[PDB]
Amino acid sequence: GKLVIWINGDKGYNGLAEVGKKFEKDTGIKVTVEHPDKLEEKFPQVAATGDGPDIIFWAHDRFGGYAQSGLLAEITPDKAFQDKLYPFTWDAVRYNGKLIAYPIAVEALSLIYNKDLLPNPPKTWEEIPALDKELKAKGKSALMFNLQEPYFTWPLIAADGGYAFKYENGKYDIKDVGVDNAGAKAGLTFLVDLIKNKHMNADTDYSIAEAAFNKGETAMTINGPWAWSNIDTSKVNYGVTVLPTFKGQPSKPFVGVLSAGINAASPNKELAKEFLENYLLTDEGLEAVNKDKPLGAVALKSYEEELAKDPRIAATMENAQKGEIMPNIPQMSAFWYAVRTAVINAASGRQTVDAALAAAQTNAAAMATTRVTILTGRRMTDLVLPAAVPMETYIDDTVAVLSEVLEDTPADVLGGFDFTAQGVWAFARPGSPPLKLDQSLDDAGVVDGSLLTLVS
Amino acid sequence: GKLVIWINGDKGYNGLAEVGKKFEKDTGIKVTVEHPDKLEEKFPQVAATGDGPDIIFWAHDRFGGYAQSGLLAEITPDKAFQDKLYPFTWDAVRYNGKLIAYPIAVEALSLIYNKDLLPNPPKTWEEIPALDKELKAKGKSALMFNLQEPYFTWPLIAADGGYAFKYENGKYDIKDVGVDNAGAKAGLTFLVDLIKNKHMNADTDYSIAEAAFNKGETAMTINGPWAWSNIDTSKVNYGVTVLPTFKGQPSKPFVGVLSAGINAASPNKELAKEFLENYLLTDEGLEAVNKDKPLGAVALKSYEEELAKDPRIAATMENAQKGEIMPNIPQMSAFWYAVRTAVINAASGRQTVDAALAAAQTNAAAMATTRVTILTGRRMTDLVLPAAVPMETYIDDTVAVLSEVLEDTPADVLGGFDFTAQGVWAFARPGSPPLKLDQSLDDAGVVDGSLLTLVS
Numbered sequence: 001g002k003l004v005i006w007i008n009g010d011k012g013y014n015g016l017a018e019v020g021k022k023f024e025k026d027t028g029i030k031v032t033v034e035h036p037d038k039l040e041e042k043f044p045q046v047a048a049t050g051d052g053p054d055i056i057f058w059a060h061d062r063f064g065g066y067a068q069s070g071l072l073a074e075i076t077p078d079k080a081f082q083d084k085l086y087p088f089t090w091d092a093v094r095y096n097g098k099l100i101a102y103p104i105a106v107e108a109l110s111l112i113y114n115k116d117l118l119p120n121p122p123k124t125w126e127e128i129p130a131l132d133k134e135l136k137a138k139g140k141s142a143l144m145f146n147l148q149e150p151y152f153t154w155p156l157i158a159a160d161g162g163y164a165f166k167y168e169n170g171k172y173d174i175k176d177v178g179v180d181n182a183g184a185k186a187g188l189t190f191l192v193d194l195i196k197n198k199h200m201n202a203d204t205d206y207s208i209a210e211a212a213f214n215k216g217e218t219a220m221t222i223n224g225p226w227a228w229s230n231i232d233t234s235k236v237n238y239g240v241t242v243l244p245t246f247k248g249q250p251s252k253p254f255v256g257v258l259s260a261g262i263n264a265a266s267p268n269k270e271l272a273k274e275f276l277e278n279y280l281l282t283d284e285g286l287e288a289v290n291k292d293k294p295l296g297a298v299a300l301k302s303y304e305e306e307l308a309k310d311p312r313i314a315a316t317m318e319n320a321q322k323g324e325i326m327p328n329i330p331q332m333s334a335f336w337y338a339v340r341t342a343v344i345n346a347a348s349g350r351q352t353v354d355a356a357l358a359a360a361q362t363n364a365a366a367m368a369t370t371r372v373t374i375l376t377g378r379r380m381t382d383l384v385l386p387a388a389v390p391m392e393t394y395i396d397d398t399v400a401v402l403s404e405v406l407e408d409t410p411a412d413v414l415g416g417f418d419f420t421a422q423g424v425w426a427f428a429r430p431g432s433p434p435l436k437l438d439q440s441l442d443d444a445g446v447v448d449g450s451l452l453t454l455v456s
Numbered sequence: 457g458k459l460v461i462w463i464n465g466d467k468g469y470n471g472l473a474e475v476g477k478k479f480e481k482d483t484g485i486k487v488t489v490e491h492p493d494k495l496e497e498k499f500p501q502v503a504a505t506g507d508g509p510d511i512i513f514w515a516h517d518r519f520g521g522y523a524q525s526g527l528l529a530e531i532t533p534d535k536a537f538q539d540k541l542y543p544f545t546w547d548a549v550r551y552n553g554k555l556i557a558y559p560i561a562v563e564a565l566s567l568i569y570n571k572d573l574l575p576n577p578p579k580t581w582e583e584i585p586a587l588d589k590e591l592k593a594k595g596k597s598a599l600m601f602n603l604q605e606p607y608f609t610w611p612l613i614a615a616d617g618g619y620a621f622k623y624e625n626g627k628y629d630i631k632d633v634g635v636d637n638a639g640a641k642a643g644l645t646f647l648v649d650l651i652k653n654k655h656m657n658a659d660t661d662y663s664i665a666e667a668a669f670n671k672g673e674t675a676m677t678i679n680g681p682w683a684w685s686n687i688d689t690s691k692v693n694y695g696v697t698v699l700p701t702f703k704g705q706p707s708k709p710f711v712g713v714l715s716a717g718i719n720a721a722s723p724n725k726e727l728a729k730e731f732l733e734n735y736l737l738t739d740e741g742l743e744a745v746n747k748d749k750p751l752g753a754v755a756l757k758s759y760e761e762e763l764a765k766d767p768r769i770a771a772t773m774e775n776a777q778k779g780e781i782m783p784n785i786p787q788m789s790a791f792w793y794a795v796r797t798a799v800i801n802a803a804s805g806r807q808t809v810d811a812a813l814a815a816a817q818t819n820a821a822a823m824a825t826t827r828v829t830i831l832t833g834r835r836m837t838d839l840v841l842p843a844a845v846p847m848e849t850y851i852d853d854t855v856a857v858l859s860e861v862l863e864d865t866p867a868d869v870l871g872g873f874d875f876t877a878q879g880v881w882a883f884a885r886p887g888s889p890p891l892k893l894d895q896s897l898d899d900a901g902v903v904d905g906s907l908l909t910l911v912s
């Protein structure tokens with residue numbers, strides 16, 4: 001028996017391996033920590049083919065998609081264990097009423113600044129250009145951060161109204177995306193103007209921003225707790241504070257709960273459970289990871305209470321409360337690819353802000369569906385159809401499906417409909433002109449449950 | 457403005473028209489009560505084309521479907537009014553969290569018997585053949601009831617294991633249908649044998665059975681409270697009692713809550729509300745209807761208490777307690793059509809019991825969908841596909857749909873996935889042989905969430 005763990009390369013993987021060593025000492029079970037690039041993207045393929053890790057660490061947003069596809073083992077910790085972690089952290093790793101991972105720590109981005117360059121950091125994003133111009137006369141810049149991952153730019157986009165999926169009545173609506181509204185637009189435009197006026201560069205990534213900050217070349221960066229360890233070993237005298245406002249509004253970072261899921265195909269699930277409950281999620285376990293790269297606000301009450309007085313963590317939590325806990329619904333992956341695309345294109349000039357976000361809006365609503373009711377004589381049959389795709393793309397196979405569904409329907413209630421008959425088929429509302437085939441159901445203004453017929 | 461009301465022709469429509477005349481007297485608003493044949497089948501088509509009644513009366517089972525398709529207005533009685541009816545009746549008219557009709561009364565089938573022909577009615581279905589021989593010697597028969605509508609045969613079909621859709625933790629599973637299991641077969645076979653052995657006739661419908669019982673030609677019938685009025689005016693001395701057992705188990709009638717829905721296109725929604733709240737659902741209103749044809753155990757607490765003492769209503773409730781409240785899910789009507797034809801065909805000998813029920817099982821089960829996740833490169837996309845239809849029927853348009861949904865996806869993530877076919881498209885699990893195109897997802901053992909790829 002053995003445990004293979006996947007964790008991101010920016011986290012305390014060496015510290016986690018120390019917890020692994022201790023576990024091995026006590027049980028004979030070897031633990032191997034790995035940090036492959038794009039592990040959150042690779043996990044589905046490998047997990048499905050029996051090649052995945054036994055345990056995967058990532059922020060909770062990815063785990064809904066994994067769970068929906070059966071990739072993660074349901075977690076059944078006793079109430080004694082559940083009590084040891086904050087309740088809102090368990091909420092982050094619940095999918096369809098089941099717990100699907102162990103929560104580890106709460107992460108939010110903060111503003112990190114160099115006290116020697118910048119004794120008083122700006123309250124507002126709008127101050128940055130003037131500050132940069134002043135700093136440029138001394139061979140420095142105001143602000144550098146990773147522009148290749150939308151995680152980092154989201155706080156600014158959401159500040160004046162950008163949102164991912166509309167939440168209400170317990171539910172996220174994947175048809176209602178907030179990536180093209182006025183707020184998101186104003187946020188991204190502000191970022192792109194920073195680039196145009198040479199206050200930032202479109203190609204700046206994680207390592208470039210981190211090096212600039214840790215070498216005293218830029219006055220500010222935006223990052224999470226994991227980054228503090230490299231800043232400590234550097235010269236820099238730094239603080240961690242609330243993100244700047246934009247148009248008077250707090251920056252609203254998406255908050256992640258670093259979580260550990262168990263592969264549903266692991267041959268060693270019981271050992272994974274014992275490793276995480278009795279070794280990792282202890283004061284001693286989290287200390288070993290946190291000492292390598294800080295976790296932020298850990299989900300473990302006893303240790304959280306112990307670190308809470310650290311001002312860097314207090315600032316993490318201040319930024320967290322101003323932000324939003326990420327959804328964990330499956331469509332988050334598609335949201336993130338869309339926003340990533342939109343930020344990168346707009347920043348580089350390949351697309352205008354309007355065009356980038358309009359496309360992202362389109363795409364984040366991946367395969368939204370509309371339920372329609374087909375009326376065939378007196379028989380009604382519900383169909384789930386793509387909302388945004390033109391009707392002509394799927395009408396033929398849809399008529400063939402209905403044919404098979406209704407084949408044993410008694411003919412009295414069928415109204416004489418014969419789907420085997422030849423035809424140029426189209427949808428129509430009863431007593432109305434047919435819907436044009438080159439439109440989607442959305443284009444046609446069709447709501448869930450709408451009654452439709454077919455006509456030839 | 458006027459109110460046009462539809463109610464079934466077995467109900468107290470003259471009594472209801474009397475409540476109508478009182479409303480007209482007080483308000484000047486004319487009320488027209490109509491009882492068209494098959495009104496529950498007609499309602500969707502006419503309602504969608506602006507020709508429906510303002511108010512429709514039917515058992516609650518139909519109203520989920522009407523509501524899903526926007527044909528019913530949302531009902532907003534204040535709490536004072538809601539407290540006047542039993543909570544369980546409101547539950548019956550709740551669809552997706554909204555009240556969609558006013559509940560009027562609880563209806564269950566009972567056994568009705570001629571006390572002069574049969575002082576002690578049988579406790580078991582199994583007794584009926586021998587009882588019928590005795591009664592034939594006297595020119596009479598034992599039992600006659602409507603065989604043309606599955607409502608009346610369902611209690612027997614359900615006794616030893618028949619069910620419509622399996623229910624558990626809050627939700628009905630339309631993939632899990634109980635129409636062709638051993639219990640349902642057992643029940644329906646018993647019925648078909650009564651007909652083979654000449655204890656009943658397959659052609660017997662509602663009027664024939666009613667006429668025979670009310671003339672004193674048959675010792676028993678099976679019917680609901682609406683029927684008692686015609687027996688009262690007849691010379692028959694009758695009792696209403698618990699249905700007989702089958703294989704030692706209670707007959708389980710499907711219980712309906714007769715309910716009044718308001719048409720979403722009614723130009724007179726407020727008038728219908730005042731009529732239903734302040735005129736029908738009062739002791740005086742319900743009494744007027746009940747005096748024409750009995751309603752059963754009414755939803756209005758004040759009047760239900762007044763009539764509870766009546767042993768005919770107590771027997772109704774006893775039968776209701778042994779049975780089950782009907783689902784109001786939209787799939788109910790399709791279920792009913794399938795079972796209707798299945799019983800008629802077995803009873804006539806046109807098909808065997810096994811083949812009739814197999815077809816109704818397949819017909820009620822063919823509406824279901826399965827959620828799958830398609831992996832293209834490292835990108836996952838959820839699709840909602842028909843569960844019981846062969847994959848080949850919809851694969852081509854499905855691939856075309858997916859191509860359109862993915863066309864603005866960034867390419868690094870699609871990992872060189874080739875969208876142009878090397879011949880026939882097929883689904884496959886990651887790293888596994890393809891699924892057979894002539895099978896459904898159900899045949900292939902695919903559950904909700906399954907990770908599939910596309911291969912050619």
Ligand SMILES: OC[C@H]1O[C@H](O[C@H]2[C@H](O)[C@@H](O)[C@@H](O)O[C@@H]2CO)[C@H](O)[C@@H](O)[C@@H]1O
Binds near residue numbers: 040060061107256336
């Ligand atoms: O950039 C989109 C990306 O954002 C988040 O990923 C974070 C992660 O939560 C942190 O733990 C940290 O490692 O940085 C990542 C961003 O580079 C989402 O969790 C992730 O799903 C999403 O793709």
Ligand SMILES: OC[C@H]1O[C@H](O[C@H]2[C@H](O)[C@@H](O)[C@@H](O)O[C@@H]2CO)[C@H](O)[C@@H](O)[C@@H]1O
Binds near residue numbers: 464496514517712714
């Ligand atoms: O036979 C199937 C039929 O059953 C029920 O209809 C009942 C109705 O509930 C009663 O009020 C009474 O009038 O008799 C009907 C049977 O003829 C369901 O309510 C109906 O939806 C279904 O088609």
